[PDB]
Each structure stands twice: as C-alpha cells, then as structure tokens.
C-alpha cells in the first residue's frame, strides 16, 4: 500500500516549496551520472 | 512614472499560496514587502 | 557519531509555527530540509 509507510515530512508546509538551485547544483551532475550510480551500488555491495 | 507588466499585489499573492515560490525568490519578495511596510508606516498611508 | 544540542525536529517546527524565523534563517532551515529529502527518498526510507 503507498499509505502504509509515509514519509511524515511530506504533510509539513516546507514540503511544498519547490527545490533550490543549490540542491539541483549539488545533486544532478551526480545522480544523472550512469558511472556515480555504478559506484554507489558497488560501495553498498560492499557493505552489505 | 507609468511602470510595465505589474499586477494587484493580492492578485499574485494568492497564487503564491497555491504554489509557493521557490525559497530564494520568496526570499527577495520578502525584501521587497520590508520595503514597503517601512514606507507605509513612516508616510502613515491611510490607504493601503 | 553523537551530536549535542538538538532537538526533535517538530520541537522547533511548531516553535516556529507561533514565532517565525527571520527569512535567512529560514532560508537555511530549508535548504537542509532538503537534504533530508533527498536522502530519505533515495533510501526510500520506511521509518521518517
Ligand atoms: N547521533 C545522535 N546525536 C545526538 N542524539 C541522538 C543521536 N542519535 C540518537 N539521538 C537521540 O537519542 C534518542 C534515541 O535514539 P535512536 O535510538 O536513534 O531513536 P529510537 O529511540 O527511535 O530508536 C533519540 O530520541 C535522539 O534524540
């Protein structure tokens, strides 16, 4: 169920502004990245 | 002076409800709002 | 890693409910919420 496990953030007004540049700045290069990906599976891999 | 594409401060504020403006041009409006309640209460506006 | 001096996140969230943060506090208030964001989405955490 999408009910079952909420994020309780979502329900708090800071959660309708929109996100910062700052964020898509720190973010985006990396995430959007297929080789970052890569080595976040790999390092958790690692832990896990 | 006449100045170009402005609208009832109300007409826009209540949109800015519905969506919120992303946290650094919220941040200036707010800078703005200063701006004017220091005007208004210095002249004491009878009609804002 | 302990960490001191914080609180329960809806500690202060409901403090600044009744007495608002000066706009740049709040600024960086926000931009850390989405850090969180972020984070408790990627982990798709079961438990915030
Ligand atoms: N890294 C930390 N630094 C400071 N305080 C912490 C830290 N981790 C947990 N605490 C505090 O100790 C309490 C118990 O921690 P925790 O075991 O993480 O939560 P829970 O009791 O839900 O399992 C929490 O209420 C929290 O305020």
């Known amino acids: 169920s999408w009910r079952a496990y909420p994020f309780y953030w979502a329900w708090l007004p800071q959660a309708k502004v929109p996100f910062s540049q700052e964020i898509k700045d720190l973010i985006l290069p990396k995430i959007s990245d297929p080789n970052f990906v890569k080595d976040l599976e790999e390092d958790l891999y690692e832990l896990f | ?48």
Not at chain 2, 6 to 14: T, V
Not at chain 2, 31 to 39: A, H, K, W, Y
């Open chain 2, 1 to 48: 002076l006449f100045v170009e594409g402005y609208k009832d401060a109300d007409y826009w504020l209540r949109r800015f409800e519905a969506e919120p403006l992303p946290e650094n041009t919220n941040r200036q409006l707010l800078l703005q709002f200063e701006r004017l309640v220091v005007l208004d209460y210095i002249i004491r506006n009878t009609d804002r």
